[PDB]
Structure 1
Amino acid sequence: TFRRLWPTIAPFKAGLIVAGVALILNAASDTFMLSLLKPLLDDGFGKTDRSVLVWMPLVVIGLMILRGITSYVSSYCISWVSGKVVMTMRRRLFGHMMGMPVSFFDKQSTGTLLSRITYDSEQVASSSSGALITVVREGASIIGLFIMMFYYSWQLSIILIVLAPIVSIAIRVVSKRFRNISKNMQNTMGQVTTSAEQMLKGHKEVLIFGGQEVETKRFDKVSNRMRLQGMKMVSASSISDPIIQLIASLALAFVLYAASFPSVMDSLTAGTITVVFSSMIALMRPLKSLTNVNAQFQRGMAACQTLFTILDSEQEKDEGKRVIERATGDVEFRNVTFTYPGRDVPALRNINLKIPAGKTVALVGRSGSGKSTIASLITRFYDIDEGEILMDGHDLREYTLASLRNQVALVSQNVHLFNDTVANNIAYARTEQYSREQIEEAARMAYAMDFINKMDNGLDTVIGENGVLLSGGQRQRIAIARALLRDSPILILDEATSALDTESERAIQAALDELQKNRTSLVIAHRLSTIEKADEIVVVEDGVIVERGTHNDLLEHRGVYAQLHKMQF
């Protein structure tokens, strides 16, 4: 039919088969109730002493116990398939957003993404299972009801089934006519209400002219008109209910009139009529739900379509073949112009950055708008629009994503934290690679030895949600320890730590210097000390690299950096 994620469900059929076969019993039981109704009324409650009012009290409760157990098992075992389908769908979907470009997560639809994964995943299988159980049970109650209703007094069955749609369509046409009549009559009431508003509007003119009495008379007339219009409207609306009631009663009266003639006689009995009528009445609800099933199956398998769109959206480019054993290379730029998608302003103009290996460079972004993007390019998160980033004699486009991202490390005050323990967080994705002693040494080199050692559970304290919830400074220290453990030749320093912790942010800074004492570092300078620590100052204005050079060179000629050293004060 419409969507066919069928393979994902294919494994979980046994559960679905059991649920369905136990669910059809959930209508077999309801039908057997009304089946037992006939012996009850005709034979039991009559002057017949007993044995239909002693066996029946037990059987009704036993069969309801069966109904309850089948309902529970059907619901649970369809919820098993729903759970094991929604869980696999969610798992696949998420596993196809961990290799999906940052562009989508650049607030293209990021806010809804959790909603997209959870609400829609819950809705797809929820609505599909609802459609199944409403097109099996309520689609089986109908079948069993018909079997019984033709088993009991088929002639009455026919005279009732032919009447039901005729009466239904007659009711529909009468209701349509009267609804149209009332809606049409509403127009006159609207007109007179507009006249009332008009009369209320002219307060000033009425008062200045002393027409209070004349306006009272005119309101008398329009209000009599309004009351008469309401009278006729209410009369027309009220004469609807008696008409439909009379039509239904006429249907019943004809049904019984047919009972007089010998055509259906001996199909009357006493119970038989009750069971047939009760079955026909109770047939509406199953059919009422069945006629609407297509809406549900569709809403749900369509959300599945919406989910499919995400599952098959753009994927991160991976057109690389070469790997890295060590990125002991020189970072090189040449006319590197880039623009982050979903925007019009160009990000970067031509670039000629020759950041050599073994030495660091501090880029200063006093403009403060879009500067960080320059770092995102070297880490291949937003694809470069124009130019190339020449790394170790090769471009990143040519180079495999995994190795490239591995060689570069990010550090920021807003660093995210995982939900596992701190020891794993430090060696995230490579816990087996390094021994706990290595992690402790990294923490030492991160100058958070006392802090990390003082957590309640020590080295393996749960560090994320449902944990101790460190502050920003401690998070920075553990991120620095992460970088130390990974020993990325390329460092990216956010330097967003506007907060100055006493005796600790200086410890943090010592950790930063030790980390960047070696290795090539690109520091998005925002603090004073880092600018002081600058090795090759790189200024940028809006989207262009205005100047480059060491501290003294740009300090001598005011240009940009020198004035920045003053407005930064």
Structure 2
Amino acid sequence: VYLRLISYLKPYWGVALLVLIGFGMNSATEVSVAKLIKFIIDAIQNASRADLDWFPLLIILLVFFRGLGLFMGGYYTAVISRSLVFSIRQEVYAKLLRLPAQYYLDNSSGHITAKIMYNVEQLTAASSESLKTIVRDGMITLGLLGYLFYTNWRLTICIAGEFVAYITAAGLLSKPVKNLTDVNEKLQRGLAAAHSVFELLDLPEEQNSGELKPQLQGAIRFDHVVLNYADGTQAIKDFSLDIRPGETVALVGRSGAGKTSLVNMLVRFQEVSSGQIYLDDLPIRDIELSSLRTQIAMVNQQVVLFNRTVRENIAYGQLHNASDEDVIAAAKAAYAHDFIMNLPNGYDTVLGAQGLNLSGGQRQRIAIARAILKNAPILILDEATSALDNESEHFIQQAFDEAMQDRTTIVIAHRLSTIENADRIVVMDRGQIVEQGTHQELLAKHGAYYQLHQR
């Protein structure tokens, strides 16, 4: 699988010609050591005083050239290694963002952060070390073998100062050739990790089949929403979900319902392959992933706040449109300004300490404030998992109602009172909808009354 690794280095053939020069000069020095040792024998035998006294300059020059070659070769191998690991890390992160997010369910965050970081370092370290040692090995072996073949010709039968030079140049093969038989160890160690990252380097991908920029419709119509849980069994049976613009409809489901799974289909998450979502001649890929994500803003019950400055969390989805007046209006709309402004100054709160500054209620209020400030054409409200009782429970409920009244919203039945206050209520049990129309008919039938009393 190492073949594709060369493509990531193909940017760097301009600098890869310097490491060859460096290790070539290193090999030249490690061959010329034999030249020097042969030189001294003849100098002593013939008592050639001039070069004999000149010898220390030869030693210093040889070691300096060896050092320069090793320095530049090693540094440029390091540059290749670091730039390669940076490029691989950036590309794998870019792809890992796009993936359809079912990978996130079964694969925990710990495994992903272990992979994307340690695995790539292991791969690049093994590859760089193997390449460095194989280049050094090959070039020194070529130089020394040429030096041997220059004098004593053949050596296959076994397998004055000139004799000394030959035996030295033959002995020098010892450590390089020992590296030769050891490269495969590092290569296989790198192989053990390469498949883990390179397989994820493609690992399928989510795309924008519709490829339509315009998505300011505000109307959603879903027909026969049937999804099979990992192709083993249907999560929810067929149901018709037609939502008119502006109007808000409340959805109530029994135990085992898709709930967040059903809503996520409307947000281009876990797209329903078995479905008939067609509104105003728009297919399942109505506009695009980015367009459908921007036009519809959800309020997740999990409520996750990034460990960054409050400036970053205030305008995550609207970076250019970051306005102080808009942020103030959002803080007024949802009763969260007091919680943010109590501990820090407020303009730049800089949330930190692993979220210890703000409690869970303040975090939920901040999430609701961000959802309100999104002001998307369509919103999905889901707060069932949140605690019913809170210090600012009434304020949070009022903020949620104000956000729902802004545009079209389909509730996830966070509270029984909220569902009752909703004008339109639709109930689907086990994937089958038995309640429809005005809430007066449902109240008269009392079908949802028992569920509300139980919950």
In which range does the TM-score fall when normalised by the shorter chain? 0.7 to 0.9
- 2:226 corresponds, among 316, 337, 343, to 337
TM-superposed CA distance for 1:549, in Å, is: 5.8
Task: Determine whether 1:283 maps to 2:173.
Answer: yes
Cα 1:452–1:135, aligned 2, differ >3 Å: closer, same or farther? Answer: same
TM-superposed CA distance for 1:409, in Å, is: 1.1
Cα 1:40–1:501, aligned 2, differ >3 Å: closer, same or farther? Answer: farther
1:364–1:526 contact (8 Å) kept in structure 2:
no
Please give the TM-score of this superposition, normalised by the length of structure 2.
0.83
Aligned residue identity for 2:379: L
Match in the other structure for 1:143: 142
2:221–2:277 contact (8 Å) kept in structure 1:
yes
Match in the other structure for 1:31: 31
Task: Determine whether 1:437 maps to 2:325.
Answer: yes
* Per-residue deviation, residues 180-218 of structure 1 (Å, max 9, x unmatched): xxxxxxxxxxxxxxxxxxxxxxxxxxxxxxxxxxxxxxx
Please give the TM-score of this superposition, normalised by the length of structure 1.
0.68
Describe how 1:189-208 pairs up with structure 2 within 5 A.
none
Q: Say which SS state the counterpart of residue 97 (structure 2) adopts.
A: coil
5+ residue gaps, structure 2, are none
Match in the other structure for 2:129: 130
Task: Determine whether 1:102 maps to 2:76.
Answer: no
* Per-residue deviation, residues 409-432 of structure 1 (Å, max 9, x unmatched): 111242344465322332224221
Structure-2 separation of matches of 1:296 and 1:137: 15
Q: Say which SS state the counterpart of residue 333 (structure 1) adopts.
A: strand
Mean alpha-carbon deviation: is it higher for 298-307 or for 547-556? 298-307
Cα 1:337–1:284, aligned 2, differ >3 Å: closer, same or farther? Answer: same
Task: Determine whether 1:401 maps to 2:400.
Answer: no
Describe how 1:441-456 pairs up with structure 2 within 5 A.
441-454=329-342, 456=344
Structure-2 separation of matches of 1:55 and 1:367: 93
2:218–2:378 contact (8 Å) kept in structure 1:
no
Structure-2 separation of matches of 1:567 and 1:337: 27
Aligned residue identity for 2:208: D
Q: Say which SS state the counterpart of residue 242 (structure 2) adopts.
A: coil
Task: Determine whether 1:483 maps to 2:371.
Answer: yes
Cα 1:149–1:354, aligned 2, differ >3 Å: closer, same or farther? Answer: closer
Identity %: 39
Match in the other structure for 1:198: none
TM-superposed CA distance for 1:65, in Å, is: 4.6
Q: Say which SS state the counterpart of residue 375 (structure 1) adopts.
A: helix
Q: Say which SS state the counterpart of residue 140 (structure 2) adopts.
A: helix
- 1:347 corresponds, among 235, 253, 256, to 235
Describe how 1:356-435 pairs up with structure 2 within 5 A.
356-368=244-256, 370-392=258-280, 394-418=282-306, 420-435=308-323
Match in the other structure for 1:79: 78
- 2:407 corresponds, among 509, 513, 519, to 519
Aligned residue identity for 2:28: A
TM-superposed CA distance for 1:351, in Å, is: 1.2
Q: Say which SS state the counterpart of residue 346 (structure 1) adopts.
A: strand
Cα 1:20–1:324, aligned 2, differ >3 Å: closer, same or farther? Answer: same
Cα 1:416–1:61, aligned 2, differ >3 Å: closer, same or farther? Answer: farther
- 2:208 corresponds, among 313, 318, 322, to 318
Structure-1 separation of matches of 2:214 and 2:418: 30
1:3–1:301 contact (8 Å) kept in structure 2:
no
Match in the other structure for 1:9: 9
Structure-1 separation of matches of 2:324 and 2:38: 78
**Structure showing greater Rg:** 1
* Per-residue deviation, residues 368-400 of structure 1 (Å, max 9, x unmatched): 553211101111211213232244563443433
Cα 1:387–1:497, aligned 2, differ >3 Å: closer, same or farther? Answer: closer
Structure-1 separation of matches of 2:212 and 2:172: 71
Structure-1 separation of matches of 2:383 and 2:121: 42
Aligned residue identity for 1:134: T
2:243–2:249 contact (8 Å) kept in structure 1:
yes
Mean alpha-carbon deviation: is it higher for 351-360 or for 542-551? 542-551
TM-superposed CA distance for 1:487, in Å, is: 0.8
Structure-2 separation of matches of 1:525 and 1:343: 28
- 2:217 corresponds, among 327, 333, 348, to 327
1:24–1:136 contact (8 Å) kept in structure 2:
no
TM-superposed CA distance for 1:515, in Å, is: 1.0
TM-superposed CA distance for 1:439, in Å, is: 1.9
Structure-2 separation of matches of 1:417 and 1:515: 19
TM-superposed CA distance for 1:320, in Å, is: 1.4
Structure-1 separation of matches of 2:446 and 2:405: 28
TM-superposed CA distance for 1:495, in Å, is: 0.7
Structure-2 separation of matches of 1:470 and 1:401: 33
TM-superposed CA distance for 1:128, in Å, is: 3.6
Q: Say which SS state the counterpart of residue 270 (structure 2) adopts.
A: coil
Task: Determine whether 1:562 maps to 2:449.
Answer: yes
Structure-2 separation of matches of 1:317 and 1:472: 35
1:128–1:301 contact (8 Å) kept in structure 2:
no
1:339–1:385 contact (8 Å) kept in structure 2:
no
Q: Say which SS state the counterpart of residue 388 (structure 1) adopts.
A: coil
Structure-1 separation of matches of 2:347 and 2:231: 45
1:366–1:526 contact (8 Å) kept in structure 2:
no
Cα 1:109–1:512, aligned 2, differ >3 Å: closer, same or farther? Answer: closer
Aligned residues: CA RMSD: 3.8
